[PDB]
Coordinates of C-alpha atoms in Angstrom, one line a residue:
Chain A
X710 CA 141.0 -109.1 -5.7
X711 CA 138.5 -110.8 -7.9
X712 CA 138.0 -113.7 -5.6
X713 CA 134.6 -113.0 -3.9
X714 CA 131.1 -113.3 -5.0
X715 CA 128.0 -112.2 -3.0
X716 CA 125.8 -115.1 -1.9
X717 CA 122.0 -114.3 -1.5
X718 CA 121.2 -117.4 0.5
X719 CA 122.6 -120.8 1.2
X720 CA 121.7 -122.8 -1.8
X721 CA 122.3 -126.2 -0.2
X722 CA 119.5 -125.9 2.4
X723 CA 117.4 -123.2 0.5
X724 CA 117.7 -120.9 3.5
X725 CA 118.8 -117.2 4.0
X726 CA 122.4 -116.4 4.7
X727 CA 121.6 -114.1 7.5
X728 CA 124.8 -112.0 7.7
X729 CA 124.7 -111.0 4.1
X730 CA 121.2 -109.6 4.3
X731 CA 121.8 -107.3 7.3
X732 CA 125.0 -106.1 5.4
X733 CA 122.8 -105.0 2.3
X734 CA 120.1 -103.1 4.2
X735 CA 122.7 -101.2 6.1
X736 CA 124.6 -100.6 2.9
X737 CA 121.7 -99.0 1.1
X738 CA 121.4 -96.2 3.5
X739 CA 124.5 -94.0 3.0
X740 CA 122.9 -90.6 1.8
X741 CA 122.5 -89.8 5.5
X742 CA 126.0 -90.9 6.7
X743 CA 128.5 -92.1 4.2
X744 CA 130.5 -94.7 6.4
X745 CA 127.4 -96.8 6.5
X746 CA 128.8 -97.8 3.1
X747 CA 131.4 -100.1 4.8
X748 CA 128.7 -102.7 5.8
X749 CA 128.8 -104.0 2.2
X750 CA 131.9 -105.8 3.4
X751 CA 130.1 -108.4 5.4
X752 CA 128.2 -109.7 2.3
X753 CA 131.4 -110.7 0.6
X754 CA 131.8 -114.4 0.8
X755 CA 134.7 -116.2 -0.9
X756 CA 134.3 -119.0 -3.3
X757 CA 136.8 -121.9 -3.8
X758 CA 136.8 -125.8 -3.5
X759 CA 139.3 -126.6 -0.7
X760 CA 140.3 -130.1 0.0
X761 CA 141.4 -131.0 3.4
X762 CA 143.8 -133.9 3.7
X763 CA 142.6 -136.0 6.6
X764 CA 141.9 -134.2 9.8
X765 CA 145.5 -132.8 9.8
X766 CA 144.0 -129.5 8.6
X767 CA 146.5 -129.0 5.8
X768 CA 145.8 -128.3 2.3
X769 CA 146.9 -131.0 -0.2
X770 CA 148.1 -129.9 -3.6
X771 CA 146.3 -132.1 -6.1
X772 CA 144.2 -131.4 -9.1
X773 CA 140.8 -132.3 -10.4
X774 CA 139.4 -133.0 -13.8
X775 CA 136.9 -130.5 -14.9
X776 CA 135.0 -131.0 -18.1
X777 CA 134.5 -127.4 -19.2
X778 CA 135.4 -124.8 -21.7
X779 CA 138.6 -123.1 -20.6
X780 CA 137.8 -119.6 -22.1
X781 CA 134.7 -119.5 -19.9
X782 CA 136.4 -119.7 -16.7
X783 CA 139.6 -118.0 -17.6
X784 CA 141.0 -116.2 -14.5
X785 CA 139.8 -112.5 -15.2
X786 CA 142.6 -110.2 -16.3
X787 CA 144.4 -107.3 -14.7
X788 CA 142.6 -104.2 -15.9
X789 CA 143.9 -101.4 -17.9
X790 CA 142.2 -98.8 -15.4
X791 CA 142.3 -95.0 -16.1
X792 CA 146.1 -94.6 -15.7
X793 CA 146.8 -97.3 -18.3
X794 CA 144.2 -95.6 -20.5
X795 CA 145.8 -92.2 -20.5
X796 CA 149.2 -93.5 -21.7
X797 CA 147.6 -95.6 -24.4
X798 CA 145.2 -92.9 -25.6
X799 CA 147.7 -90.1 -25.9
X800 CA 150.0 -92.5 -27.8
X801 CA 147.1 -93.1 -30.3
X802 CA 146.3 -89.2 -30.5
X803 CA 149.9 -88.5 -31.6
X804 CA 149.9 -91.1 -34.2
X805 CA 146.5 -90.5 -35.7
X806 CA 147.1 -86.8 -36.5
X807 CA 150.5 -87.5 -38.0
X808 CA 149.1 -90.3 -40.1
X809 CA 146.6 -88.4 -42.0
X810 CA 148.8 -85.3 -42.5
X811 CA 151.1 -87.4 -44.8
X812 CA 148.9 -90.2 -46.0
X813 CA 146.5 -88.1 -48.1
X814 CA 149.3 -86.5 -50.2
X815 CA 151.3 -89.6 -50.4
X816 CA 148.5 -92.0 -51.8
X817 CA 147.5 -89.7 -54.6
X818 CA 150.9 -89.3 -56.1
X819 CA 152.1 -92.8 -55.1
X820 CA 150.9 -94.5 -58.1
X821 CA 150.8 -91.9 -60.8
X822 CA 154.5 -91.2 -61.1
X855 CA 127.9 -115.4 -27.0
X856 CA 126.2 -118.5 -25.7
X857 CA 126.2 -116.8 -22.3
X858 CA 126.9 -120.5 -21.6
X859 CA 129.1 -122.6 -23.8
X860 CA 128.9 -125.5 -21.4
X861 CA 132.4 -126.6 -20.6
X862 CA 133.3 -128.5 -23.8
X863 CA 133.8 -132.2 -23.2
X864 CA 137.5 -131.4 -23.1
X865 CA 139.0 -132.0 -19.7
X866 CA 141.5 -129.6 -18.1
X867 CA 143.1 -129.9 -14.6
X868 CA 142.2 -127.2 -12.1
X869 CA 144.5 -126.8 -9.0
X870 CA 143.1 -127.1 -5.6
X871 CA 142.6 -123.8 -3.7
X872 CA 142.3 -121.5 -6.5
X873 CA 139.6 -118.9 -7.4
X874 CA 136.7 -121.1 -8.8
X875 CA 133.4 -119.8 -10.2
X876 CA 130.1 -121.3 -9.1
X877 CA 129.4 -122.7 -12.5
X878 CA 132.9 -124.2 -13.0
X879 CA 132.6 -125.9 -9.6
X880 CA 129.9 -128.2 -10.8
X881 CA 132.2 -130.0 -13.3
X882 CA 134.9 -130.6 -10.7
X883 CA 135.2 -134.3 -9.8
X884 CA 137.9 -135.7 -7.6
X885 CA 140.2 -138.2 -9.3
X886 CA 139.3 -141.8 -8.1
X887 CA 142.8 -143.1 -9.1
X888 CA 144.2 -140.3 -7.0
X889 CA 144.7 -140.8 -3.2
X890 CA 142.4 -137.8 -2.3
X891 CA 138.7 -138.7 -2.5
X892 CA 135.8 -137.1 -0.5
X893 CA 134.2 -139.3 2.3
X894 CA 130.9 -138.9 0.6
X895 CA 130.5 -137.6 -3.0
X896 CA 131.4 -134.1 -4.1
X897 CA 128.8 -131.4 -3.6
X898 CA 129.5 -129.9 -7.0
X899 CA 130.0 -126.5 -5.3
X900 CA 132.4 -124.5 -3.7
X901 CA 133.2 -125.0 -0.1
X902 CA 135.4 -127.1 2.3
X903 CA 135.2 -130.7 1.5
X904 CA 137.1 -133.1 3.7
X905 CA 139.0 -136.0 1.8
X906 CA 140.4 -139.3 3.1
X907 CA 143.9 -140.0 2.1
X908 CA 144.4 -143.5 1.0
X909 CA 148.2 -143.3 1.5
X910 CA 149.8 -141.3 4.3
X911 CA 153.2 -143.1 3.4
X912 CA 153.5 -141.1 0.2
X913 CA 154.5 -137.5 1.1
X914 CA 152.1 -135.0 -0.2
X915 CA 153.1 -131.5 -1.3
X916 CA 151.5 -129.3 1.3
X917 CA 150.5 -125.5 1.6
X918 CA 150.3 -124.7 5.3
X919 CA 147.5 -122.8 7.0
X920 CA 148.3 -119.2 7.9
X921 CA 148.3 -119.8 11.7
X922 CA 151.3 -122.2 11.2
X923 CA 153.3 -119.6 9.1
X924 CA 153.2 -116.9 11.8
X925 CA 154.7 -119.3 14.5
Chain B
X238 CA 121.3 -131.4 15.5
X239 CA 122.4 -133.2 18.7
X240 CA 120.8 -136.4 17.5
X241 CA 122.7 -136.4 14.3
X242 CA 126.0 -136.2 16.1
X243 CA 124.8 -139.0 18.3
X244 CA 124.5 -141.2 15.3
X245 CA 128.0 -140.4 14.2
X246 CA 129.4 -141.0 17.7
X247 CA 129.0 -144.7 16.8
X248 CA 129.8 -144.2 13.1
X249 CA 133.0 -142.1 14.1
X250 CA 135.4 -141.7 11.3
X251 CA 136.9 -138.2 11.6
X252 CA 136.9 -137.6 7.8
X253 CA 133.1 -138.1 7.7
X254 CA 132.2 -136.3 10.9
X255 CA 134.3 -133.1 9.9
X256 CA 132.7 -132.9 6.5
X257 CA 129.2 -132.7 7.9
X258 CA 130.5 -130.1 10.3
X259 CA 131.6 -127.8 7.4
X260 CA 128.3 -128.1 5.6
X261 CA 126.4 -127.1 8.9
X262 CA 128.4 -123.9 9.7
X263 CA 127.9 -122.4 6.2
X264 CA 124.2 -122.9 6.5
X265 CA 123.1 -122.4 10.0
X266 CA 122.7 -119.4 12.2
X267 CA 125.3 -118.2 14.7
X268 CA 122.8 -118.5 17.5
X269 CA 122.4 -122.2 16.7
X270 CA 126.3 -122.7 16.6
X271 CA 126.6 -121.4 20.1
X272 CA 124.0 -123.6 21.7
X273 CA 125.2 -126.7 19.9
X274 CA 128.9 -126.5 21.1
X275 CA 127.8 -126.3 24.8
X276 CA 125.6 -129.4 24.4
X277 CA 128.3 -131.5 22.6
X278 CA 130.8 -130.6 25.3
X279 CA 128.6 -132.4 27.7
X280 CA 128.0 -135.1 25.3
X281 CA 131.8 -135.6 25.4
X282 CA 131.7 -135.6 21.6
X283 CA 135.0 -135.8 19.7
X284 CA 136.9 -132.5 20.2
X285 CA 137.9 -132.4 16.5
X286 CA 134.3 -131.6 15.5
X287 CA 134.1 -128.9 18.3
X288 CA 136.9 -126.9 16.6
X289 CA 135.2 -126.6 13.2
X290 CA 131.9 -125.5 14.7
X291 CA 133.6 -122.6 16.4
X292 CA 134.5 -121.5 12.8
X293 CA 138.2 -120.8 13.4
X294 CA 139.5 -123.6 10.9
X295 CA 137.6 -122.1 8.1
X296 CA 138.9 -118.6 8.8
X297 CA 142.6 -119.6 8.4
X298 CA 141.8 -121.6 5.3
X299 CA 140.2 -118.6 3.6
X300 CA 143.1 -116.3 4.5
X301 CA 145.6 -118.6 2.7
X302 CA 143.2 -118.6 -0.3
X303 CA 143.0 -114.8 -0.5
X304 CA 146.8 -114.3 -0.1
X305 CA 147.8 -116.7 -2.9
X306 CA 145.2 -115.7 -5.4
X307 CA 144.7 -111.8 -5.0
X308 CA 145.3 -109.9 -8.3
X309 CA 145.5 -106.1 -7.6
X310 CA 145.5 -103.2 -10.0
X311 CA 148.2 -100.6 -9.7
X312 CA 145.8 -98.1 -11.4
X313 CA 143.6 -97.6 -8.3
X314 CA 146.6 -96.0 -6.6
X315 CA 147.3 -93.5 -9.3
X316 CA 143.5 -92.8 -10.2
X317 CA 142.9 -91.9 -6.6
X318 CA 145.7 -89.3 -6.6
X319 CA 144.8 -87.7 -9.9
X320 CA 141.0 -87.3 -10.1
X321 CA 140.2 -87.2 -6.3
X322 CA 141.3 -85.1 -3.5
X323 CA 141.8 -86.7 0.0
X324 CA 141.0 -83.3 1.6
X325 CA 137.3 -83.2 0.3
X326 CA 135.0 -85.3 2.6
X327 CA 133.0 -86.9 -0.2
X328 CA 136.0 -87.6 -2.4
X329 CA 138.2 -88.9 0.4
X330 CA 135.5 -91.4 1.4
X331 CA 134.8 -93.0 -2.0
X332 CA 138.4 -94.1 -2.4
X333 CA 138.5 -95.6 1.2
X334 CA 135.3 -97.6 0.4
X335 CA 136.6 -98.9 -3.0
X336 CA 140.2 -99.7 -1.6
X337 CA 138.7 -101.3 1.6
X338 CA 136.7 -103.7 -0.6
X339 CA 139.8 -104.3 -2.9
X340 CA 142.3 -105.7 -0.4
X341 CA 139.6 -107.4 1.7
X342 CA 140.3 -110.4 3.9
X343 CA 144.0 -110.0 3.8
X344 CA 146.3 -107.4 5.4
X345 CA 147.6 -105.2 2.7
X346 CA 149.7 -102.2 3.4
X347 CA 151.1 -101.4 -0.1
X348 CA 148.2 -99.0 -0.7
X349 CA 148.6 -97.2 2.6
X350 CA 152.4 -96.7 2.2
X351 CA 152.2 -95.4 -1.3
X352 CA 149.2 -93.0 -1.0
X353 CA 150.8 -91.7 2.2
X354 CA 150.5 -87.9 1.2
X355 CA 147.0 -88.5 -0.1
Chain C
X18 CA 141.7 -82.7 14.4
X19 CA 139.8 -79.5 15.3
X20 CA 136.1 -78.6 15.1
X21 CA 133.6 -79.8 12.6
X22 CA 132.3 -76.2 12.4
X23 CA 129.0 -77.8 11.4
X24 CA 126.1 -75.7 10.0
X25 CA 122.7 -76.5 11.4
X26 CA 119.8 -77.7 9.4
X27 CA 117.4 -75.0 10.0
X28 CA 114.1 -76.5 10.9
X29 CA 111.4 -73.8 10.2
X30 CA 108.0 -74.3 11.7
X31 CA 104.9 -73.6 9.7
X32 CA 103.6 -70.9 12.2
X33 CA 106.9 -69.1 11.8
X34 CA 106.7 -69.4 8.1
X35 CA 103.3 -67.8 7.7
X36 CA 104.2 -64.8 9.8
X37 CA 107.3 -64.3 7.5
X38 CA 105.3 -64.2 4.2
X39 CA 102.7 -62.0 5.8
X40 CA 104.9 -59.3 7.4
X41 CA 107.5 -59.2 4.7
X42 CA 105.4 -59.3 1.4
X43 CA 102.9 -56.8 2.6
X44 CA 105.7 -54.5 3.8
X45 CA 107.3 -54.2 0.4
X46 CA 109.2 -52.0 -0.6
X47 CA 110.4 -51.3 3.0
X48 CA 112.5 -53.9 4.6
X49 CA 111.5 -55.5 7.9
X50 CA 113.6 -57.3 10.5
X51 CA 113.2 -59.3 13.5
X52 CA 114.5 -62.0 15.7
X53 CA 114.0 -65.8 15.6
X54 CA 113.0 -67.5 18.9
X55 CA 113.8 -71.3 19.2
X56 CA 115.7 -74.0 21.0
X57 CA 118.9 -75.7 19.9
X58 CA 119.5 -79.3 20.4
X59 CA 122.1 -81.7 19.1
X60 CA 124.8 -80.1 16.9
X61 CA 122.6 -80.0 13.8
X62 CA 119.0 -79.7 14.9
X63 CA 117.7 -76.1 15.6
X64 CA 113.9 -75.8 15.9
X65 CA 112.7 -72.3 15.2
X66 CA 109.4 -72.3 17.1
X67 CA 108.5 -68.7 16.7
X68 CA 109.4 -65.4 15.0
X69 CA 108.4 -61.8 15.6
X70 CA 108.9 -58.4 14.0
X71 CA 110.9 -56.0 16.0
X72 CA 109.4 -52.3 15.6
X73 CA 110.2 -50.7 12.2
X74 CA 113.1 -48.4 11.8
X75 CA 114.1 -46.0 8.9
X76 CA 117.7 -47.3 9.0
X77 CA 115.9 -50.5 7.7
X78 CA 118.4 -53.1 8.3
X79 CA 121.7 -52.2 9.8
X80 CA 123.8 -53.1 12.8
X81 CA 121.9 -50.3 14.7
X82 CA 118.4 -50.8 13.3
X83 CA 118.4 -53.9 15.4
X84 CA 118.8 -53.2 19.1
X85 CA 119.0 -54.7 22.5
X86 CA 116.4 -52.2 23.6
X87 CA 113.9 -53.6 21.3
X88 CA 115.2 -57.1 22.1
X89 CA 114.8 -57.0 25.9
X90 CA 111.5 -55.1 25.8
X91 CA 109.5 -57.7 23.7
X92 CA 111.2 -60.5 25.6
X93 CA 109.8 -59.2 28.8
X94 CA 106.2 -59.2 27.6
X95 CA 106.5 -62.8 26.3
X96 CA 108.4 -63.6 29.6
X97 CA 105.2 -63.2 31.6
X98 CA 103.2 -65.2 29.1
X99 CA 105.7 -68.1 29.6
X100 CA 106.1 -68.3 25.8
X101 CA 109.7 -67.0 26.1
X102 CA 112.5 -69.1 24.5
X103 CA 116.0 -68.2 23.7
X104 CA 117.0 -66.2 20.6
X105 CA 118.4 -68.5 18.0
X106 CA 119.0 -65.9 15.4
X107 CA 117.7 -63.1 13.2
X108 CA 115.9 -62.6 10.0
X109 CA 115.5 -59.7 7.6
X110 CA 113.8 -59.2 4.2
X111 CA 115.4 -58.3 0.9
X112 CA 112.4 -57.6 -1.4
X113 CA 114.5 -56.1 -4.2
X114 CA 117.2 -58.9 -4.3
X115 CA 117.6 -62.6 -4.1
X116 CA 119.0 -64.5 -1.1
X117 CA 122.3 -63.0 0.0
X118 CA 123.8 -60.8 2.7
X119 CA 125.0 -57.3 2.1
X120 CA 128.4 -56.3 3.5
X121 CA 126.3 -54.6 6.2
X122 CA 124.2 -57.8 6.9
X123 CA 127.4 -59.7 7.6
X124 CA 128.3 -57.1 10.3
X125 CA 124.8 -57.5 11.7
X126 CA 125.2 -61.3 11.7
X127 CA 128.5 -60.8 13.5
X128 CA 126.9 -59.1 16.5
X129 CA 124.3 -62.1 16.8
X130 CA 127.2 -64.5 16.3
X131 CA 128.8 -63.1 19.5
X132 CA 125.4 -63.4 21.3
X133 CA 124.9 -67.0 20.2
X134 CA 127.3 -69.0 18.0
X135 CA 124.4 -70.9 16.3
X136 CA 122.9 -67.6 15.1
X137 CA 121.5 -67.7 11.6
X138 CA 121.0 -64.8 9.2
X139 CA 117.9 -65.5 7.0
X140 CA 117.2 -63.5 3.8
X141 CA 113.6 -63.5 2.8
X142 CA 112.6 -62.6 -0.8
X143 CA 108.9 -62.8 -0.9
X144 CA 107.6 -60.9 -4.1
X145 CA 109.8 -62.7 -6.4
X146 CA 108.6 -66.0 -4.9
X147 CA 105.8 -67.5 -7.0
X148 CA 105.3 -70.5 -4.5
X149 CA 106.1 -68.6 -1.4
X150 CA 108.4 -71.2 0.3
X151 CA 111.0 -70.9 -2.6
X152 CA 114.0 -68.4 -2.5
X153 CA 114.3 -68.1 1.1
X154 CA 117.6 -69.3 2.5
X155 CA 119.4 -69.5 5.9
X156 CA 123.0 -68.8 6.4
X157 CA 125.8 -68.8 8.8
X158 CA 129.1 -66.9 9.0
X159 CA 132.4 -68.3 8.0
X160 CA 135.5 -66.5 9.0
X161 CA 138.1 -65.0 6.6
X162 CA 140.7 -67.3 8.2
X163 CA 138.3 -70.3 7.4
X164 CA 138.5 -69.7 3.6
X165 CA 142.4 -69.7 3.7
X166 CA 143.0 -72.8 5.8
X167 CA 140.2 -74.7 4.0
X168 CA 137.6 -75.5 6.7
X169 CA 134.7 -75.5 4.2
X170 CA 134.8 -79.4 3.6
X171 CA 134.5 -80.2 7.4
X172 CA 131.2 -78.5 8.0
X173 CA 129.4 -80.9 5.5
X174 CA 131.1 -84.1 6.7
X175 CA 129.1 -87.1 5.9
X176 CA 125.9 -85.4 4.6
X177 CA 124.6 -84.8 1.1
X178 CA 123.4 -81.3 2.2
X179 CA 122.1 -78.5 -0.2
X180 CA 124.4 -75.7 -1.3
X181 CA 122.1 -73.1 -3.1
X182 CA 122.9 -72.1 -6.6
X183 CA 120.6 -69.2 -7.8
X184 CA 122.0 -65.8 -8.5
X185 CA 125.4 -66.1 -10.1
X186 CA 127.1 -62.8 -9.1
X187 CA 125.3 -62.4 -5.8
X188 CA 125.4 -66.2 -5.1
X189 CA 129.2 -66.7 -5.8
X190 CA 129.9 -63.6 -3.7
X191 CA 127.7 -65.1 -0.9
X192 CA 129.2 -68.7 -1.3
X193 CA 132.8 -67.6 -1.1
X194 CA 132.4 -64.6 1.2
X195 CA 129.1 -63.8 2.9
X196 CA 128.2 -67.2 4.3
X197 CA 128.0 -71.0 4.0
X198 CA 124.6 -72.4 3.2
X199 CA 123.2 -75.7 4.1
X200 CA 119.7 -77.1 3.7
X201 CA 116.5 -75.6 5.0
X202 CA 113.6 -77.8 5.9
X203 CA 110.0 -77.2 7.0
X204 CA 108.3 -79.3 9.6
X205 CA 104.7 -79.2 11.0
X206 CA 102.2 -81.3 13.1
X207 CA 99.3 -83.3 11.8
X208 CA 97.0 -81.4 14.3
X209 CA 98.0 -78.2 12.4
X210 CA 97.6 -79.6 8.9
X211 CA 93.9 -80.1 9.8
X212 CA 93.8 -76.4 10.8
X213 CA 95.7 -75.2 7.6
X214 CA 93.2 -76.8 5.2
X215 CA 90.2 -76.0 7.5
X216 CA 87.2 -78.3 7.7
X217 CA 83.9 -76.6 7.1
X218 CA 80.3 -77.6 7.2
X219 CA 79.6 -75.6 4.1
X220 CA 81.7 -78.2 2.1
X221 CA 78.8 -80.5 2.4
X222 CA 76.0 -78.0 2.8
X223 CA 77.0 -76.7 -0.7
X224 CA 76.5 -80.3 -2.0
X225 CA 72.6 -80.3 -1.2
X226 CA 72.2 -76.7 -2.5
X227 CA 70.4 -76.9 -5.8
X228 CA 71.5 -74.0 -8.1
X229 CA 69.0 -72.7 -10.5
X230 CA 67.8 -74.5 -13.5
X231 CA 68.4 -71.6 -16.0
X232 CA 72.0 -72.5 -15.4
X233 CA 71.5 -76.2 -16.4
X234 CA 69.8 -75.1 -19.6
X235 CA 72.6 -72.8 -20.5
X236 CA 75.2 -75.5 -20.0
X237 CA 73.1 -78.1 -22.1
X238 CA 72.7 -75.7 -24.9
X239 CA 76.3 -74.3 -25.0
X240 CA 78.5 -77.5 -24.7
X241 CA 76.5 -79.3 -27.6
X242 CA 76.7 -76.2 -30.0
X243 CA 80.5 -76.0 -29.4
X244 CA 81.2 -79.5 -30.5
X245 CA 79.2 -79.1 -33.7
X246 CA 81.9 -76.6 -34.8
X247 CA 84.9 -78.9 -34.2
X248 CA 82.9 -81.9 -35.6
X249 CA 83.2 -80.3 -39.1
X250 CA 86.9 -80.1 -38.6
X251 CA 87.1 -83.7 -37.4
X252 CA 85.5 -84.8 -40.8
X253 CA 88.4 -82.9 -42.5
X254 CA 90.9 -84.7 -40.3
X255 CA 90.0 -88.3 -41.4
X256 CA 89.2 -87.5 -45.1
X257 CA 92.4 -89.2 -46.2
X258 CA 95.2 -89.3 -43.6
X259 CA 97.0 -92.6 -44.2
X260 CA 99.9 -91.6 -46.4
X261 CA 103.5 -91.9 -45.0
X262 CA 105.4 -89.7 -42.5
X263 CA 103.5 -88.8 -39.4
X264 CA 104.8 -85.2 -39.2
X265 CA 103.4 -84.4 -42.7
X266 CA 100.0 -85.6 -41.5
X267 CA 99.9 -83.4 -38.6
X268 CA 100.5 -80.1 -40.4
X269 CA 98.2 -80.9 -43.4
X270 CA 95.1 -82.3 -41.5
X271 CA 95.8 -79.8 -38.6
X272 CA 96.3 -82.6 -36.1
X273 CA 98.2 -80.1 -34.2
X274 CA 95.9 -78.6 -31.5
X275 CA 94.1 -81.9 -32.0
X276 CA 90.3 -81.5 -32.8
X277 CA 89.5 -85.2 -31.9
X278 CA 90.9 -84.7 -28.6
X279 CA 89.1 -81.4 -28.0
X280 CA 85.8 -83.0 -28.9
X281 CA 86.5 -85.6 -26.2
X282 CA 87.3 -83.1 -23.5
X283 CA 84.1 -80.9 -23.9
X284 CA 82.1 -84.1 -23.9
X285 CA 83.5 -85.5 -20.7
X286 CA 83.1 -82.4 -18.6
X287 CA 79.5 -81.9 -19.5
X288 CA 78.8 -85.6 -19.1
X289 CA 80.3 -85.7 -15.7
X290 CA 78.2 -82.6 -14.5
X291 CA 74.9 -83.6 -15.9
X292 CA 75.2 -86.9 -13.9
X293 CA 75.9 -84.8 -10.7
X294 CA 72.9 -82.6 -11.5
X295 CA 70.3 -85.6 -11.7
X296 CA 72.0 -87.1 -8.7
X297 CA 71.6 -84.1 -6.4
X298 CA 68.0 -83.4 -7.6
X299 CA 66.8 -86.9 -6.9
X300 CA 68.3 -86.9 -3.4
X301 CA 66.8 -83.4 -2.6
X302 CA 63.3 -84.1 -3.6
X303 CA 62.6 -87.4 -1.5
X304 CA 64.8 -86.4 1.3
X305 CA 63.0 -83.1 2.2
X306 CA 59.5 -84.3 1.3

């Protein structure tokens, strides 16, 4: 659902993500037995910055300033697909024929009678925690120092779970529970 | 690895120790993860750290992410019906592979239920 | 739910292949028939180790041309020699047609199906092969029932396969009636490859044989004279040739059937040979005496 990206290696330690590689070799081979195709699944890795409020293991809702250009990291659309295309195409075919069958006669007598990268603009915009966040966009993210939620040590500048210390526990924080809690 | 966690036994703030735990699991090999948890158990290290290094926290966290933020096309359902035939072995497979990747990491049964004849 | 109904990749050994081109091609126009001897392993790997020609018959190929009397008799001879292995199918040759089964050859297939359910029917067209190995295909029955209830997809589950496409009438007849085709593959050992090329001592003995010197003279004379003729034409090529549009140039200066290029080719062949000729003669003279 447009939320995963495939990681080649761990970029933080400069060392192979093992699980991914084994996925890809097994994926290539599929001429022989098509269900080898499913091993592409294991290479998917999700990408998001996820704050963790204390050691409670709950996700705070808070936001971070991101100096970037919005258009760049607009959340990719819902596609048209083939179904949407048929409807839209056939609508155009109708109109197009009709048009010219009337326009030609009417007109005569009418009168007579880039930067792959655009940085992220210096403009700030707030990005919610635990949303789909591109690798490039993650760089600009900086935790708000006024705000209660600050990482124990400075932000990686990359997607992944980063644990925050909460200055005030007194002040209720809006929370999104983990899934295990929902089922009970 | 063990020695690092002996340093933070003394410098034990659970916010700091946990953070370092997340970084480690993303990076390191499963084989390492196994050997480390046995050793730390006998260290009698903090059982908070032990939980992360199992990898179960991270799993839940990513499931909530995928539920909330999935964006699905309705056009896959219809495309599958129209062009492709779920009887033919090649054609039936391609759809399963594309759909499987689509709804990944989250239970989804909308597709199953709708393309139930297919 | 039910059966895959899978069709074997028919693994044809080189020895079997060579007897098929020999007996069939030579025997044109009269058709020839015979059994295939092999071993069946897996559910997709049939190794056809050997073939033989069953004694000719004037009914050519028919249900009754083939016989158990012939089958048994031949088997018994090979039985003693310990080279006996189970019948994995039957071949016959169509020298006048492409690869497909007559209405009759299906009936013939049907008796061998009852014998062994992995029985193949292989139609060999050898005269209208220009590489030998091409236009020979292996087949297996599919029931009349199978076509109705749609059991053609199952057989090729999870495999790219080859479904043959030559002959449009005769093929589509075969594809939707006579039989289902899947890929046919040739395998051989690297002991045998050595035998097929054949090493000889006369490959190298011919390299120290010094052919007569009348023949060196002729080559010297000839090659040089020839390039004198196309060297006039070359002068013509480059007289102007620098005005626009490349196509225009190639018709006017006759750069079609290129004279520059032909000069180079004649030059290279002779140049190469005259160097072999000095090289052999020098080796011969000291080495002997």
